[PDB]
Design a protein around this ligand. Sequence first.
Ligand code: HEC
Ligand code: HEC
Ligand code: HEC
Ligand SMILES: [Ca+2]
Ligand SMILES: [Ca+2]
Ligand SMILES: [Ca+2]
Ligand SMILES: [Ca+2]
Ligand SMILES: [Ca+2]
Ligand SMILES: [Ca+2]
Ligand SMILES: [Ca+2]
Ligand SMILES: [Ca+2]
Ligand SMILES: [Ca+2]
Ligand SMILES: [Cl-]
Ligand SMILES: [Cl-]
Ligand SMILES: [Cl-]
Ligand SMILES: [Cl-]
Ligand SMILES: [Cl-]
Ligand SMILES: [Mn+2]
Lengths: 106, 106, 106
Amino acid sequence: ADLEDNMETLNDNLKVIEKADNAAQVKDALKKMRKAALDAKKATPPKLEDKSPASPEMIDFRVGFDELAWEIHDAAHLAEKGKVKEAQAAAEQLKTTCNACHQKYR
Amino acid sequence: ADLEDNMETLNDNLKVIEKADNAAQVKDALKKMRKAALDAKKATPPKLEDKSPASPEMIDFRVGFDELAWEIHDAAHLAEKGKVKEAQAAAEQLKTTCNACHQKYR
Amino acid sequence: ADLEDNMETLNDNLKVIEKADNAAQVKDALKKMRKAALDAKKATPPKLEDKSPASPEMIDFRVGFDELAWEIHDAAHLAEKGKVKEAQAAAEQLKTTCNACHQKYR
Ligand code: HEC
Ligand code: HEC
Ligand code: HEC
Ligand SMILES: [Ca+2]
Ligand SMILES: [Ca+2]
Ligand SMILES: [Ca+2]
Ligand SMILES: [Ca+2]
Ligand SMILES: [Ca+2]
Ligand SMILES: [Ca+2]
Ligand SMILES: [Ca+2]
Ligand SMILES: [Ca+2]
Ligand SMILES: [Ca+2]
Ligand SMILES: [Cl-]
Ligand SMILES: [Cl-]
Ligand SMILES: [Cl-]
Ligand SMILES: [Cl-]
Ligand SMILES: [Cl-]
Ligand SMILES: [Mn+2]
């Protein structure tokens, strides 16, 4: 999928997690975020189309999705230990990672 | 190890997992797959030797191993909860990720 | 942070883990290592400054941090099951991955 669709998947599943009522809903949404995050990592964002494909900005951009994916996995660890409300709080904390990339490249 | 060796390791351990009799055999084989997947990520496949090293195809290629490593990890989570049959089924499902890359770059 | 700050973080938290007294201290230190590992992945090490940004050495370098992050996570799994001493042993074993990269690019 393209970058925008992957971002909407990220945003949609954050709101699913917030409203989720059991561990299985959280874990399924988190899996969809991780998939979207890895798929977004294949893209060139519009503000970096003029840079080299392995410029430090494109590397930083791509590693940003590794960091997002690992943080998502931390939340997944909380959810499958049954710590649903802790997992939902960790999901909401992902926004600091969303924001950090946006302020640089969005 | 070179790309072909890593691919044989991936294929060999898929069959070890299929025939495994306990969680420890599944976990050990999945670990060897993840290692092989990350090692394969360092290579240039023959069909992409003419593209630039960070072309969209080489990025798609490299991220394909991230996707495979995470999917392997999902199976390891099943095997660590002692859900051996589920872990074996998830390992069989990895083939859709194997295939998807092959049809583009093999 | 820059590359050498991330390396000091990696080295400091290895010593924290060696001296840790409970799972929480191991888990917290491992997570600082993973973060530092992914951040170091964004850098160009002095010995590769003259190489192409996606040369096979820079790819090998960056994948070295994926391998390090996954090995850290393996130790994190041990510590999350309360196997504190096994987690500490695995953290010591990380040094073979530290060394392997240093001998090539440090
Ligand atoms: C891309 C992201 C890939 C993923 C994921 C997997 N494979 Fe693969 N494979 C890929 C390429 C580009 C090649 C060509 C290698 C060459 O130099 O010819 C291959 C090759 C194989 C082979 C045959 C290797 C040989 O005998 O010479 C096998 C058996 C194989 N791949 C298996 C395999 C499996 C089981 C995977 C998932 C678990 C898998 N591959 C992932 C690219 C990619
Ligand atoms: C590559 C894939 C590496 C891995 C994995 C690890 N390190 Fe590293 N390290 C690497 C380089 C290229 C450098 C040179 C940095 C420079 O700017 O000169 C380093 C450096 C260090 C240092 C010294 C840093 C300093 O004090 O200036 C230390 C203490 C260090 N590295 C430790 C370390 C540990 C403990 C690792 C594993 C847990 C590790 N490194 C991994 C490249 C790579
Ligand atoms: C970089 C490493 C990013 C991370 C991590 C996240 N996002 Fe992002 N996002 C990024 C870019 C470069 C763009 C611009 C895309 C474009 O083509 O214009 C975006 C965009 C979005 C959007 C808007 C998409 C749209 O509706 O057109 C949303 C809603 C969005 N991003 C949300 C989002 C969330 C919730 C993230 C993590 C929790 C996140 N993004 C991570 C770059 C990066
Ligand atoms: Ca896509
Ligand atoms: Ca839009
Ligand atoms: Ca609800
Ligand atoms: Ca190799
Ligand atoms: Ca058997
Ligand atoms: Ca677990
Ligand atoms: Ca940094
Ligand atoms: Ca120093
Ligand atoms: Ca110094
Ligand atoms: Cl996850
Ligand atoms: Cl790259
Ligand atoms: Cl990468
Ligand atoms: Cl794994
Ligand atoms: Cl971890
Ligand atoms: Mn895990």
